């Protein structure tokens, strides 16, 4: 009636990744702009 | 003893207990090499691709 009934440091989940991931995505948009600028410069 | 004598309120507890030496230095489990959540690893792979 009492004993029979029976049912660690935190792990980075989406706090570290959010900042890092936003950086990677932010670079990708800038990279797309850079290539368009680079191709435009190479056009002339 | 309580049948022939008359005891009193137990002022100290006792019983047939078990003594076990404590396991010094708990070892990190096999899955201790993953601090990142499973969603963490999947997101990293997708970003790499």
UniProtKB/Swiss-Prot annotation, chain A:
Disease: Neurodevelopmental disorder with or without hyperkinetic movements and seizures, autosomal dominant: An autosomal dominant neurodevelopmental disorder characterized by severe intellectual disability and developmental delay, absent speech, muscular hypotonia, dyskinesia, and hyperkinetic movements. Cortical blindness, cerebral atrophy, and seizures are present in some patients. Neurodevelopmental disorder with or without hyperkinetic movements and seizures, autosomal recessive: An autosomal recessive neurodevelopmental disorder characterized by severe intellectual disability and psychomotor developmental delay, involuntary and stereotypic movements, spasticity, and inability to walk without support. Intractable seizures manifest in some patients.
Protein name in UniProt: Glutamate receptor ionotropic, NMDA 1
Lineage of producing organism: Eukaryota, Metazoa, Chordata, Craniata, Vertebrata
Post-translational note: NMDA is probably regulated by C-terminal phosphorylation of an isoform of GRIN1 by PKC. Its phosphorylated state is influenced by the formation of the NMDAR-PPP2CB complex and the NMDAR channel activity.
Places the protein is found: Cell membrane; Postsynaptic cell membrane; Postsynaptic density membrane; Synaptic cell membrane
Bilayer-spanning residue ranges: 16-39
UniProt similarity note: Belongs to the glutamate-gated ion channel (TC 1.A.10.1) family. NR1/GRIN1 subfamily.
UniProt superkingdom: Eukaryota
UniProt domain comment: A hydrophobic region that gives rise to the prediction of a transmembrane span does not cross the membrane, but is part of a discontinuously helical region that dips into the membrane and is probably part of the pore and of the selectivity filter. The extracellular N-terminal domain (NTD) is a site of allosteric regulation to modulate overall receptor function.
Functional note: Component of N-methyl-D-aspartate (NMDA) receptors (NMDARs) that function as heterotetrameric, ligand-gated cation channels with high calcium permeability and voltage-dependent block by Mg(2+). NMDARs participate in synaptic plasticity for learning and memory formation by contributing to the long-term potentiation (LTP). Channel activation requires binding of the neurotransmitter L-glutamate to the GluN2 subunit, glycine or D-serine binding to the GluN1 subunit, plus membrane depolarization to eliminate channel inhibition by Mg(2+).
Impact when changing residue 17 to V: Slight decrease in glycine agonist potency; no effect on glutamate agonist potency
Swiss-Prot record, chain B:
Subcellular localization(s) per the UniProt record: Cell membrane; Postsynaptic cell membrane
Binding site for L-glutamate: 1
Glycosylation site positions: 24
Subunit note: Heterotetramer. Forms heterotetrameric channels composed of two GluN1/zeta subunits (GRIN1), and two identical GluN2/epsilon subunits (GRIN2A, GRIN2B, GRIN2C or GRIN2D) or GluN3 subunits (GRIN3A or GRIN3B) (in vitro). In vivo, the subunit composition may depend on the expression levels of the different subunits. Interacts with PDZ domains of PATJ and DLG4.
Domain-related comment: A hydrophobic region that gives rise to the prediction of a transmembrane span does not cross the membrane, but is part of a discontinuously helical region that dips into the membrane and is probably part of the pore and of the selectivity filter.
Function: Component of N-methyl-D-aspartate (NMDA) receptors (NMDARs) that function as heterotetrameric, ligand-gated cation channels with high calcium permeability and voltage-dependent block by Mg(2+). Participates in synaptic plasticity for learning and memory formation. Channel activation requires binding of the neurotransmitter L-glutamate to the GluN2 subunit, glycine or D-serine binding to the GluN1 subunit, plus membrane depolarization to eliminate channel inhibition by Mg(2+). NMDARs mediate simultaneously the potasium efflux and the influx of calcium and sodium.
Family affiliation: Belongs to the glutamate-gated ion channel (TC 1.A.10.1) family. NR2D/GRIN2D subfamily.
Clinical disorder: Developmental and epileptic encephalopathy 46: A form of epileptic encephalopathy, a heterogeneous group of severe early-onset epilepsies characterized by refractory seizures, neurodevelopmental impairment, and poor prognosis. Development is normal prior to seizure onset, after which cognitive and motor delays become apparent.
Protein name in UniProt: Glutamate receptor ionotropic, NMDA 2D
Originating organism: Homo sapiens (Human)
